C-alpha cells in the first residue's frame, strides 16, 4: 500500500569488517542506519503509514488570519466599515506553519465568519430584521471606498459576496494569484535597486485589500459585527524547508525578535530523573 | 423539484472538510510552475535530518553556545557519567526544540525508532572509548556502568571515523506513544559512560568536546495533528 | 464524470464517488491522497553515492 | 576518497583531506531552459571569464570567536568580470560552488558549521525599526556574530544562538552543510544551484543566499603550537547568464 | 435467510439409553439441549431472526455523555467557556452499555446539541442577532485557552466546527483514535512500574479535551448556553464480555461501590403467587 | 443549480439514523487489528451462557450467599415443595438479575425456549429423585404433586451425572411476549417436588444443596431495544 | 459506485442504493447488516467436543 | 426524500458565480442575429490598436 | 445529458459535469470557455494584404 513505512528485517549475530555504525558527519550526511545494524531484531510487518504527515494533510486545515470589527452607527465613518491588507502574518498559528518553508504555491478556500451583537445605550432597536454584509475584494490599485454608502460598493468587476445572517458561512475558492511562481515567505532583499527602502517580504506582498460593511442603515440603533477570515491552502506544493521559529514574533512586517534561550533549563547534564 | 432531506450537520463550518466551492475569479490564468529545487513532499523528510541536540542545557548554558557541547576530560576517569537524559523526543528540555522534536509537537502520537549520532570534536591524536547505552523503562535508571551495560549498548572507538550512531529501538507494548508523555507511555533513559578514557600525547589539549545529533529512521510515523504549545500571542500583530 | 476512487482504511464497499461541479481547477477538493516522497534530497545530498557498510573515509 | 580537484575556468582548487561534495538539494547548476524563461531578449553567457574561482578575504578563528556570515552575490561585487556584468545587466541567474578551507594541525581541535541559507532574512537589534544595507554585508570583509546581545539601533541582531534570524542555531542543518572538524577534515565544498521563486532576479536588491560559518566546538591548542588559524573562502559562479543590458549602475 | 433461529424438528415417543437431559455442569459447559429431547414437539418453521440483537444494532444509538454550560457575561472568565476531558463515564446510560465488554474498537459520530436562553437582570438585550459557537477539540498536549478571546481559538491544526443557532446540529465522524488496538474499558493495573500511582482506567484515558465558547461579544446582556454531546459508536467490534453491573456508580474515575443485594426480596422460596 | 424540495423531517436529530458525516481528522492512520480472543458478534452469545439463579431470595438471604442455594432435607418427605416461581425471565425477583435477564431488560419483546439446569451439590453417597414441572398459565398454580404431574415435567435421578436440564417450551398464542409482563402475556409457573426423597448412609450429612442455572436455547430472540430500569443517577459523576 | 443492496423485510422493490461521498472509511454509515455469530466460544469452550446424547462422565 | 447536507457557502450571493436560474419569461422568441460588422471576441483586439500618446502633457 | 467537459488548469481528474435543468436557453450558465479571436478586422482593415518585410510605400 501507500505510503507505508519500512519493515525491520530479522538479524542474527555477526562479526564483520563492514561496520555500519561508524560514519562521518563531516560530509554533511544523515546516516541510513536502521536498528538491524547495531542489534539483533525480529521480522515485524510494520503496517503504519505516513498519510497524516504529508504536505497536503498538514496544511489543509482552516486557520484564522484576521479579526475585524465595524459598526452601523452614525458619525465616525471609518468605524462603519473594516479594512484589511491581505496578510498571513497577523495571526501566529498560521504564520509559524507557513514559515517552515521558504516558498509555497497553492490554491485556497476563504471562509468568512461574521458574528454580531447589539450595542448598548438609549434608543435601542427592539425589532430588527436580519443583517446583510458585503465583503468586497479589491485587487491592487482599485477604487477604495471612503465610507459606507459609497460609489465603490457597486463592484462591477471586484468580486463581492452578499451574506445574510443566520445561514452558513460564506466560502469561495481562489487560485494561485501571485505574480511569480511561488508565494515567497522570505525575501532577503530590498525594494529599490540602490539597496534602500523596505527590507523584507513586505514589498512582495501585493495581493490587494478586503472591505466589509453593512448594506443596511437600520435607522434606530447600533449593532457591531466581527468578521473573522479563515484560510485553507489546498493543492499545496512547498520548497526549501526552514527551521521552525524560536523567539516570539513582534511585528507583522518583520522578522525582528529578541534573543531567547535555545531550550528550557534542567538541573544537570545527567538528569535522567525523575 | 427533487425531494431532499437535510441531515444533521448542515450549515456548519468544520475546519477540516474537503468540499468544493465556487471560484471567486473564474477562468484565471496561473503562472506556469518552474522547477524550484528542494521540493518537500512529506514532513518526515525534514524530521529525518540530523540536528544538534542541546544536552548541556543546565542554566546558565541555554543563553550561550555551550548547550550543544559535552565536556570530556582526562584523569583518571570512569566513575563519572558523560551525560544522561530520558527518552522523550516531543516533551523534554533536551530535544523537543530540535528538528525532530519541533515537527513532533505538531502531532499527538508518534512511533518508530530514533537515531543518535555522536561526533568527537577533539584533537586527531586523542584516543578514547565510550559506552552508549539505552534502557527500557521497566526499572530504575542506572547509576554506574555495571547497571548500564545490561541494556542496549554500543561501544564507540574514536579513530579515523569520528561518529557512531546509537540507534534506539522501538520497544513498547503499544503501536504508538504520546508526544506529551506520562508515566504510562514512558520510553526509558539514554546514558553515556567512559569505557576506557581519553589518552592524549604531550602537547595536546587534555579536554575535548562531543556533539549530539538526533533524527528519525525510515519507520518513524506521526499521527493526530494538533497545535504546538510553543508560540503564543495576545493581540493582533501590527 | 464518476471518478470512483478508494477510501481510507487500515490494513489488518471501500469506494467513493466524486464529481467536479465547477469549471475551474481551483474549485476542486483537496488532493489528500497523493502520498509520494523523496527524502534523498535532504538526507543524502551527495555527489557520490555513499554505502552504509563501506566506510565513509 | 579524500583527494579531490575542482577546475573551473582558468583556476583549479586542490585538496588532500576532503569530506565529500554536498550538491545543494540534489540538483546541479545549469542554464535556464526555454520552457521556463520569461526574458525575451538573447542572454549573454561568458563561460570562462565569469565562471571561475574567486578567493574572498581571510578571517581569524580565535579561541573566543563565535561566527561570521557573507551574503551572496553581494560579496563578489568587485571580484573580476563577474562583478562587471552585474552592473551592466538588469537580470542575472547563477549557481555557485563554495569552497571553505581551514587547515590547522594534528594537535589542534575544533569544529565549524558551513551552511548556505537561501533567503536568510535577518532581524534588527532595535525592534520596531529596520536595518540598513551597510549593516547587512560589508564590501569584502565578513560580518561577525556577537556572543552577547547586540545593542545597536540599525544593526543586525548578531547574537549567535538565534543565528541572526530568530531560529535555533542547531536546526541550521537542513540547509546544504558540511563540517570542518580539524581532527578529520581540512576543507568543505558545497555546490548550490539557483534557488529562487522567479526564473531570474536582479542581483543588487536580492541576496540569493547567505554563507554562514559558525564554530560549534571552539578552538583550543597548546602554547607550543601555532596561534593563527585562518579560514579562507573561495566561491566560483557556475552557469551564469544575464539579461537587460543598459548603462552601468552603479557605476 | 440471515440470521434466523433454529427450527424445532418433530419428535415422537422414545425409550433410549441416550439421555440428553442428564449432563454435568462441572466441566464448565452450557448444555445444547433443545426442547425435542425432553418432550414431544412438532415441526414449526421459526421465522424469527436475531438482527436486532447484534453488536452493531445494539450500540449504534446516540447517547448523551456530557452537559456543559457557559456564559456570555463580563467577569469570571472561567464561566465564559466550558471544558471537558473526554470520557464515557460521566453519564450512566452509556457507561453501563459499554461496560458489558472488556475491549471495544469502533468509529464514532459526535453530535452537539446547543440550547440557549436569556439570563435575567437589568439591562436586557431586546434585539439580538443569532449566536455562533466554536467547538474546538484539543489533542493531548495542545495549547489550552485560558479564556474566551484567546490566541488558542485560532486552531490552525485543532479541528473546530462553527455553528449558528437555528440550523441542524453539528456532526462529524471520528476514526479509531486509540494508541493501542482496543478501547480498554477496564484496566487492572497501575500507571508507574513500582505499583504506585493511579489504579484503574483513568491512566489509559488520553484522548484530549473539548472546549466550547461564544465567538460573539453581544455588548449588552448575558445569554447562557448548554452544550450536550452525543456519542454513536459505529463499525463496532467487541471482545471479552463482562457481567453487567449491580451496584450504582459513585465516581467517574473508579469502579468503587457500596455492596448491594443481589436481587429484590420475595415472600417465600415457593412463591408462585399471585 | 438543481431544483430540490425539502421534505418534512429536515434539520432534525434522530438518535438512531444511519447517515454519513464528514470526518474531523481526515486520512487518519488507524492501528492494525490484532486477534484478541473472545469476540462478541451477537448479544445472544452471552444470554446462552448458564448463570446461577437466586431462587432463595427471601430477605434475609439477598445480602448473603444463601440466595443461590436450595435447601433439601431428610425425613420423611414429599408433602413439601422444593421451590416455586413464575416464568417471567425479564420481570421477576428471581431471575431478572441473572445473565439472561440482564440482556432481556435492554429489550421490550422476547421469544423462545428457556433452559433450567439443576446441580445437586450434596455428598456422593446421597441418592434422591425429584420432579421438575412446568405449567402453562391457563389455570391455578399447583399445590401438590398430583396437580403438578399433569404439566410438562421431567424426573431427575441423582447419580454419577449430577445435572438435569428442564427445558421450558415456548407455549403461547403470540409470537412474542413482553419483557415487562402482565396478565395477558403471562407464561406460567415452575415448581419442584420430591419424587422419593433423600436417602443417606450413616456418617453422611443429612441435608444437601441444589443450585439453579438459567440460559437460552438456540431459538431465543429479542426485539425492540429500550433502556434498562436498573441503573439511575441524579447529577453528573465527578 | 452504486452499491445496490437489499432492504430489511420479514419473511412470510426491496433494493436500496448507497454512495460513499467522503474519502475516509470512518465517514461511512453503520454496518447494520452483518449478522454473523459464533456462540461456541462461550457455550462450548472445551478441548474435547462433547456430544449431547453421549454421557459427559 | 434524498438525504443531503448543506455545505458552508450556502444562501450566499457571489457576484461572479456561474449558476443556472429559472427564466422569468419562458418560451420567449428572440429576434434572429444579423451579421453586424465589427464583432469583438476579445478585449486584446482593442488594445492592439495604435492610439496617440499625450507625451507633452506638461500643464498648460 | 452528462456533458463532460474539461476544467481550467495551467499548462506547465480535470473534467467536470454539467446538466441543463430548465427548458430555456437563457437559463443556462455562462459560456466562459469560448476563446476565439480575430484581431485582423481592427489591426489590418486593408483592401490589400500588407507584408511586414516588404515596404508599405
Ligand atoms: C468579497 C469576496 C472576497 C474574495 C476573497 C479573495 C481575497 C483573498 C485573495 C488573496 C488570498 C490568496 C492567498 C494569499 C497568501 C499570502 O498572500 C502568501 N502566503 C504571501 O505571499
Ligand atoms: C470542534 C470539533 C470537535 C471534534 C470532535 C472530536 C472529539 C472526540 C474525540 C474522542 C472520541 C473518541 C471515542 C472515545 C471513546 C472513549 O474514550 C473510550 N471508550 C475509552 O477508551
Ligand atoms: C452540475 C453537476 C450536476 C450533477 C452531475 C450530473 C449527475 C451525475 C451524472 C453521472 C455521470 C456523468 C458522466 C461521467 O462522469
Ligand atoms: C460527491 C458525490 C456526488 C454524487 C455521486 C455521483 C452521482 C451518482 C453517480 C452514480 C454512478 C457512479 C459510478 C458507480 O459507482
Ligand atoms: C430535472 C433534472 C434532474 C437531474 C437530471 C437527472 C439525473 C442525471 C441523469 C444523468 C443522465 C441523463 C442523460 C444524459 O444526459
Numbering used by the authors:
A (entry chain A), E (entry chain A): 10 to 283
B (entry chain C), F (entry chain C): 1 to 238
C (entry chain D), G (entry chain D), I (entry chain D): 2 to 13, 24 to 68
D (entry chain B): 11 to 261
H (entry chain C): 1 to 60
Please give sentences taken from the publication describing this entry:
Human enteroviruses (EV) are presently classified into four groups, Enterovirus A-D (EV-A, B, C, and D), among which EV-B, the largest group, consists of over 60 serotypes, including all 6 serotypes of coxsackievirus B (CVB1-6), coxsackievirus A9 (CVA9), over 30 serotypes of echoviruses and more than 20 newly identified enteroviruses. The capsid proteins (VP1, VP2, and VP3) adopt the classical eight-stranded anti-parallel β-barrel configuration with the N-termini residing inside and the C-termini exposed on the surface. Most of the uncoating receptors bind to the “canyon” sites of the viral particle, dislodging the “pocket factor” in VP1 and subsequently triggering conformational changes of the intact particle to release the genome, albeit that SCARB2 binds EV71 outside the canyon.
The phylogenetic tree could clearly separate these human EVs into three groups: EV-A, EV-B, and EV-C. Within each group, viruses with distinct receptors were further grouped into mono-phylogenetic clades. To test the robustness of our structure-based algorithm, we determined the structures of three other human EVs (CVB1, CVB5 and Echovirus 3) and put these into our algorithm. The in silico analysis suggests that CVB1 and CVB5 are CAR-dependent human EVs and E3 utilizes FcRn as a functional receptor, predictions consistent with experimental reports.
